[model samples]
Target chain A: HGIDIVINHRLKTSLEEGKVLEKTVPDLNNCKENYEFLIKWTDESHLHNTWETYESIGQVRGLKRLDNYCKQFIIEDQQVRLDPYVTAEDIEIMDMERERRLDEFEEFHVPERIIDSQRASLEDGTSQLQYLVKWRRLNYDEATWENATDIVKLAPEQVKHFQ
Target chain B: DFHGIDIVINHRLKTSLEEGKVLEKTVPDLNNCKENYEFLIKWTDESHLHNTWETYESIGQVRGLKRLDNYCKQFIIEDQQVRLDPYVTAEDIEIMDMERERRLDEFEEFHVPERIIDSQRASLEDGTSQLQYLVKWRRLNYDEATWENATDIVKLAPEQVKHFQK
Candidate 1:
């Protein structure tokens, strides 16, 4: 199965609005951009493939499927046509995309529901409010204690409506 | 550009155990024998790779008898869900016990060879000749055919060597 588009709670937006199927390299030196990829969207038919720049695919809407494609077609040359397809610039952009995906994945934890709340005094002589958050895609056993300020920022409605 | 005080964070450190710790327990089958129950034993100073299995008699002398007993209870409870046919028979355990004896025999003080199964020769860097003999150890399996020095085998048992050569 391919990587699915899900809402990143920290960014408050969906990561990868559209999923990509394959990435093919065109003429790099003739192009204005450093590299360009022929992107075939998974939702659309195979014959309806569109040509998009490296900036568009990576910056506009990057795909984990594209990440896998670049890795498979990695070549040891700077030329346009080789047995192995992807250039060093494509690899560098892939690394950047992977790092960005990791950052987004780390921040993608969305609290399914607020179960309970507790007030505790810190060692520095200050009282703080914390909420026990039951996270989505995780069990109740892995539910964590989150700060009220942080919870208020991410999910103010949940905190307000929480009994 | 930066201004901060030194913060000494306090964290708990690990303490060494007095004896070997029983990390896990596994039963090969629902067979009512002491050999079937094995404990994943961890020593006080050894790494995870060094962890070995100890059956009933050996594990009983160790420090985690209560833990092993508790594991037995849990095994019974867990086995209630799926009752498969006993794959490990009584004959299988007898073979396992015999194999264990062979393993122990390797480290014993006075381990003697039964016969020389095969022999071969080779030359050293200085043109000196060397001979090696395949020793079939007494009370051990054919798989444990150890390559030993030809001189040691000939000196110890001349009759066995003669019989092998003949």
Candidate 2:
């Protein structure tokens, strides 16, 4: 769900999708965007950790980890080299993660708003109030019949208005 | 069994032995509709290899109305469209006969088994061991059990594995 990077062993470089695990010190000696963090992976084991650039640790959580590493003052000489550079590529990847999270949240079927309700009698002869629930991120045609009592806990105001 | 959206192909009547005077029940909805009103469905995002027929009400409980409406619209029958049918009348009956002459299960097709009933270790010829599980399929009799690979069972039913393994 974070930054995804891919490292090609044959090419000896990273391409599009991998993740960062922990932040180490910046190798200022490399002289080109030298803040190197240990990259973790979603599927691969820790044995595949790579020293990727600061931009490669493009996610917010990874960037914050790098900030804490800087605060440790492991070496005073490395302080001036702690500059973080963010590229448009990093923002694009961040947006992609956000989009995926949005889809995941919708999958949980949380009630967004109540459209309509009715009193219906069950097979037992007792009647119950049911609401037509329009779940978030889903279409109106997909609305479902939820008991009114169950809908109250999820979105109280919507139920209050419907009632 | 695998869980995903599936397309409903046809419906049928199901019967069982009981009551000494032939008490009847529908596979989908026996009382409300003509019979069970079960649906023969081939899973979406899956090959034709995986197909099953279960009660209409049962499928609605597992998967929401989105895919169910998708099938109704494709075949031009709005019978299952969203409605406030607090109680259905026996007089209302619209029989769906899409593939009337051809039986859907005439050939051997795969029905996704729901859970692992039991597990055992199988000894291979190479002296190594592999795990196999007894799977109890949905909508099938208990005697029709089959042995499945441990790896596949682990992915398909993780919670079921925990119960059996423990």
Candidate 3:
């Protein structure tokens, strides 16, 4: 994950559209009123290198003040929360694993026992736990057996203990 | 054998006369005959006209000789004017023969500059950002029960899911 600060000028709006009717090019000169900030991330380390290399092209020399202002801890925290993986490489590895798991699910059904075991593994209260829960939900949502009539017919048996 | 010889001689005479007439009519300006002949000879050599002729003649037997001759004449005229002109002919070909080499080059060259390349790279990064935003949006909107039952990942958060899941 990464953060960026941008500056733009506000323009007067016509009441009809409830949107800015006209806008000026961002006043890179202004300190506070002109600028906005954003966060970005990628699942690949190479993509981070690409994004940084491109973003540097738009960075001007005097823009350091704006950069400094936008580089505050609050925005940093928010950006880091967006992708809490420790490194870009870690994010890439996680994504690769997720894709491999999805491919495996497509080829061979993910047994209910395996799904249950995966959920139980997330009980450890680590950051990986939250990510695992989220990942499992996505995997289940994307799985084929979820809609199979056989699974639907067996739903009662599957749900009897939970209920 | 005598009859066959007679037929061969007659056919050769007819072919030579027809070919000569075509060349005369095609190069009406006698002063330009050498230029046109050179152009035609070069084209015939480069395009492997002998090989094409063998194939065309096989088809021409069924299609008729007059129709084939007319078609060939039309192609010959079009090929000479369109392909052999200084403006249309390739630079390498013109430069190959030393006499015709005048370098009034008008070909358009294309290249991407570093700044434009940088901007395009930035736009690609922005596109990735937009995709990530959509993925995050979908993840937030996903309902557990419906998500579990989704057939397609994109359909994971349909409005019907919220109503049907509970």
Candidate 4:
């Protein structure tokens, strides 16, 4: 969770919509890293290995601070399990699960937090606004906008805040 | 499928989404990525992977709509719901599974504080849509029953959504 540079502070996404309050989440996807960096479980276990393996040939005087930076933790005893970056192994596992999920029909719970949303209009004067929800579980890439009117009934104060 | 934060997953039955890992993800029968995208794009409304245009320009953000459009250009949904691939990969699934299991496990371990339902009615939030039932909580000897959302309670138990079981 401690990966954003533009936001200056890398807090857990669930508790922090401050990054998107008036600022769009930056397209770090096109950055040199190729995607947003999530805290990987490996980061906690192999900080020394990360520097020794990658910077063994390169020069690094500030390896102390770099190695000290590990922000991953088990939430409610559950791990986030992201990689420091996307890897080929990630693709294989994801492709496999995507295939596995393709033939299944289930409704996964959407995260309770709304990272971002915008109202898609239906009626006028008395418009029934439809919400395009960007769930916290998804990245900007996987984020889909949907009408959560039914779900919004579960969260009226949140809607009232926007009004 | 059930509702609410307090419940147990009944694995022996044909219940859905109690656990995405132990319960397994359900898939829909479709032909192509277009079909997959087609299904998602209409989930409730013109469902989009992109942001609403106003938010795009108003909330100090941009390129979401365009990037979301550009994002769907890989692989094929013909073989899957998305003809292409997601940039998130398995990390998304792993995070989600951990969350699901933790929620279920936590509920299994956590004991009830004797919260009970008071009353319920059909949701008026979105009249044109499916009836989202609203619930009220009761109290006298119970102490606190300030009418929290009861939809989940009715859903997790059998024949409770309309039973008006206060």
Candidates' C-alpha lDDT: 0.45, 0.47, 0.25, 0.29
Candidate 3 lDDT, tens digit per residue, B103-123? Answer: 112100000000110001113
For model 1, chain A alone compared with the true chain A gives a TM-score of 0.38
Pairing residues by index, what is the TM-score of model 4?
0.18
Q: Interface root-mean-square deviation for each candidate?
A: 29.0, 25.5, 37.5, 22.4
lDDT of 1 by residue, A8-90 (tens): 11100111101110122323222323323444344322112333434444444446545444434332122333326557787
True interface contacts retained by model 1 = 0.00
- Taking the tens digit of each residue's C-alpha lDDT, what string does model 2 give over A22-50? 12243423322323343334432222234
CAPRI rating of model 3: incorrect
lDDT of 1 by residue, B51-142 (tens): 33445554355554555555544443233222222565667657656765674454331235677888888678999988988877565547
The CAPRI category of model 1 is: incorrect
Scored against the native two-chain complex, candidate 2 gets a DockQ of 0.01
Q: Indicate which candidate wins on lDDT.
A: 2
Task: State residue B146's C-alpha deviation in candidate 3, in Å.
Answer: 50
Q: Individual DockQ of the candidates?
A: 0.01, 0.01, 0.01, 0.01
lDDT for model 1, on a 0 to 1 scale? 0.45
Which model is ahead, 2 or 4, in terms of lDDT? 2
Please give, for residues A6-120, the per-residue lDDT of candidate 3 as tens digits.
2211111101111111111222233132222221222211111111112332533435534554444223322443443557776576567646744642322212322221212
